Amino acid sequence: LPDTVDWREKGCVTEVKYQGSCGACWAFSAVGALEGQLKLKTGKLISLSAQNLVDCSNEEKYGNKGCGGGYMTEAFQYIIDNGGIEADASYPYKAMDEKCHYNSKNRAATCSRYIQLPFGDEDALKEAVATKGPVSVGIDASHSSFFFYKSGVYDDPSCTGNVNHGVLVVGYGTLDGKDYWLVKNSWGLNFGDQGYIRMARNNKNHCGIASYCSYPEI
Ligand SMILES: *C(=N)CNC(=O)[C@@H]1CN(S(=O)(=O)c2ccccc2)C[C@H]1C(=O)N1CCOCC1
């Protein structure tokens, strides 16, 4: 396995999104992982509709809550169940809950199944990232040390495995002798480092990064 992976170098990662007050991280994280497969299979890079997930997966069938939060694995299941998802350009992000208005004429991607990695297993996360591509994961983003992240490897002892925020692992590497996961957030380009964070890797499943890993198959 390469020391360093970074999926932007393969063109598989779209622009950082800003979710605002809508608890849509899960949706962002899930479109992220499917954008990557969608590049990797078709060769095109197209921001997928995180609104479509918000609007349409808000029922007990999934346990997603729209702006109330939800789960990247249930996002993937909705795409499978629904037979597609639109691009953002046709089903755009509004930062609120709205009535489902998914139109199959506008399908831009499909999902056939999704994979889950084993809980905590950072080795399994690395393989995935290396050979499969960006992977959806949950983090404990609840500390000001994460919010105000600027640089270096994020490695705050106060973090816990109690996850509450859906992000996308687009890579990994080593920095000044600290392993990291390159994480894409959905807090706009004023967060962390160009809207990214490098998060401790191989440090006891720091902030539960490897607790809840999944990615879709086309
Ligand atoms: C995003 N802006 C707010 N956070 C969420 O929607 C979180 C994301 N996930 S998780 O990554 O914390 C997780 C994923 C799989 C298994 C356990 C946790 C959960 C979601 C969340 O906080 N909730 C789900 C819906 O109801 C409220 C709690």
Side-chain angles (χ1 to χ4, degrees):
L1 289 196
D3 288 344
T4 315
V5 176
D6 174 2
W7 290 99
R8 276 169 318 163
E9 290 186 329
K10 291 83 136 249
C12 288
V13 172
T14 66
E15 66 267 20
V16 185
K17 297 321 181 311
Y18 169 75
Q19 72 186 67
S21 284
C22 172
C25 52
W26 61 276
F28 291 92
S29 161
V31 291
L34 194 67
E35 287 166 2
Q37 302 300 308
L38 182 58
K39 168 78 199 173
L40 271 153
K41 287 286 201 292
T42 67
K44 316 259 75 156
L45 191 55
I46 351 256
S47 294
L48 302 159
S49 178
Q51 206 62 63
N52 182 167
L53 306 168
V54 188
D55 287 353
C56 312
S57 67
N58 196 348
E59 33 232 45
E60 306 203 317
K61 147 115 118 165
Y62 306 104
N64 288 340
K65 276 181 192 262
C67 293
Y71 298 93
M72 293 76 72
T73 53
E74 297 307 319
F76 311 133
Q77 187 55 62
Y78 159 83
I79 302 164
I80 302 164
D81 295 355
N82 183 62
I85 185 176
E86 286 187 52
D88 185 81
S90 74
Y91 192 141
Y93 191 65
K94 319 287 177 174
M96 336 153 316
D97 289 298
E98 302 212 340
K99 186 187 173 160
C100 194
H101 58 76
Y102 176 81
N103 185 354
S104 55
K105 212 219 150 233
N106 295 313
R107 158 196 284 121
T110 59
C111 179
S112 72
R113 49 208 266 78
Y114 60 93
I115 299 66
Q116 301 185 230
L117 292 178
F119 173 96
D121 188 344
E122 295 194 62
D123 291 332
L125 185 56
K126 194 185 147 184
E127 166 95 312
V129 163
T131 60
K132 311 294 189 326
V135 169
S136 291
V137 307
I139 66 146
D140 177 4
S142 71
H143 306 277
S144 58
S145 61
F146 184 94
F147 298 39
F148 297 104
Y149 176 83
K150 233 328 173 158
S151 72
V153 177
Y154 183 53
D155 205 334
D156 179 357
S158 315
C159 230
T160 70
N162 290 139
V163 304
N164 47 40
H165 181 63
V167 297
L168 179 71
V169 172
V170 318
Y172 71 75
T174 303
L175 182 72
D176 291 341
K178 316 200 190 200
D179 301 337
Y180 70 81
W181 298 117
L182 181 70
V183 175
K184 174 185 201 197
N185 195 4
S186 54
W187 290 4
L189 287 175
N190 256 151
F191 169 80
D193 175 5
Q194 293 169 90
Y196 290 73
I197 179 167
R198 292 178 141 86
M199 299 179 67
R201 185 162 46 95
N202 298 334
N203 184 23
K204 46 264 273 225
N205 181 44
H206 185 236
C207 304
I209 191 152
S211 299
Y212 304 113
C213 308
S214 59
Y215 65 93
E217 305 217 294
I218 302 157

